[PDB]
Design a protein around this ligand. Sequence first.
Ligand SMILES: Cc1cccc(O)c1
Ligand SMILES: Cc1cccc(O)c1
Ligand SMILES: Cc1cccc(O)c1
Ligand SMILES: Cc1cccc(O)c1
Ligand SMILES: Cc1cccc(O)c1
Ligand SMILES: Cc1cccc(O)c1
Ligand SMILES: [Cl-]
Ligand SMILES: [Cl-]
Ligand SMILES: [Zn+2]
Ligand SMILES: [Zn+2]
Lengths: 21, 21, 21, 21, 21, 21, 29, 30, 29, 30, 29, 30
Amino acid sequence: GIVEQCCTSICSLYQLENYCN
Amino acid sequence: GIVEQCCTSICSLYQLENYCN
Amino acid sequence: GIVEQCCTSICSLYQLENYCN
Amino acid sequence: GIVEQCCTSICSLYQLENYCN
Amino acid sequence: GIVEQCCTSICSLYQLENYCN
Amino acid sequence: GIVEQCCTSICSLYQLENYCN
Amino acid sequence: FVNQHLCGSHLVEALYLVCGERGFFYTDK
Amino acid sequence: FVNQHLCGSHLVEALYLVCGERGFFYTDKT
Amino acid sequence: FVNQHLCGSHLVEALYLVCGERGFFYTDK
Amino acid sequence: FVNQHLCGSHLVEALYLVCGERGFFYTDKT
Amino acid sequence: FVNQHLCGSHLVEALYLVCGERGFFYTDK
Amino acid sequence: FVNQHLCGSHLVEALYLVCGERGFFYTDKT
Ligand SMILES: Cc1cccc(O)c1
Ligand SMILES: Cc1cccc(O)c1
Ligand SMILES: Cc1cccc(O)c1
Ligand SMILES: Cc1cccc(O)c1
Ligand SMILES: Cc1cccc(O)c1
Ligand SMILES: Cc1cccc(O)c1
Ligand SMILES: [Cl-]
Ligand SMILES: [Cl-]
Ligand SMILES: [Zn+2]
Ligand SMILES: [Zn+2]
């Protein structure tokens, strides 16, 4: 999940963008 | 929508909660 | 206090609302 | 008030600090 | 500037990134 | 740096202002 | 434009708090 | 509503959103 | 309406920083 | 872009900024 | 005035994320 | 003014509020 990917770890733009519609 | 509804006139928490899930 | 209740611990809406005027 | 004063014209920190305590 | 450019019309991340460094 | 001064430690106004232009 | 993009900024943060774990969908196009 | 720690500005804002027209009082650490 | 509710959002966060421990009262009705 | 942990409202906002016109979906903890 | 000071608030936070370590300069006077 | 750690966006914003018309420069970790 975003949370577990980008919160508990560091997340890139591309990674942050996997969650756009 | 939420934008038309909430930006134009002030939405409360209970009116925001309609846009949940 | 709010701080000690809702910061150092987790705080509900009802709890968060004890501090409205 | 702070809303009339600060939203209408840009308030600094020193002008915000009047609304403290 | 960024204010004239971004406040007036919606700037994306790629348009914000011009104002970096 | 700001980060190391005001993030990893606590930073005053005067200290926070060393970084204005 | 901006006045509804600056407003969306506030909306989504208003909906993170309210919705919480339930989550929300933020689109409209 | 979130089941989370709300500190600092995230509090004041949550107060702000949660209280509305009523308004509020923040004292910080008491 | 919104333009002074979106503005209040910024105000109160501006006052948390400034006021700090002293705290503040945010009403006006 | 920052190489940082983004949690809570800092996420939703980063999503918001990163997605734009497209929009997004936030589920929180999955 | 306010509508471009409330907007600057959003801009700089938009630029912290984007710019990251590189940093940014936020002036215009 | 708060006696707190100010990190990330809470910094840039505090800079923003604290500097005003002058403006500022943020470098992050130096
Ligand atoms: C909480 C909030 C922010 C912005 C607009 C609204 O209608 C409601
Ligand atoms: C810091 C700040 C935010 C919004 C309006 C103001 O007048 C001042
Ligand atoms: C992200 C963002 C916020 C405010 C105005 C803009 O043009 C862009
Ligand atoms: C109202 C609106 C427009 C464009 C994108 C969105 O996520 C929402
Ligand atoms: C100016 C104003 C109106 C309504 C509620 C408030 O807290 C402040
Ligand atoms: C556009 C503008 C005006 C005043 C101060 C600033 O930092 C930026
Ligand atoms: Cl705004
Ligand atoms: Cl935080
Ligand atoms: Zn935060
Ligand atoms: Zn705003």
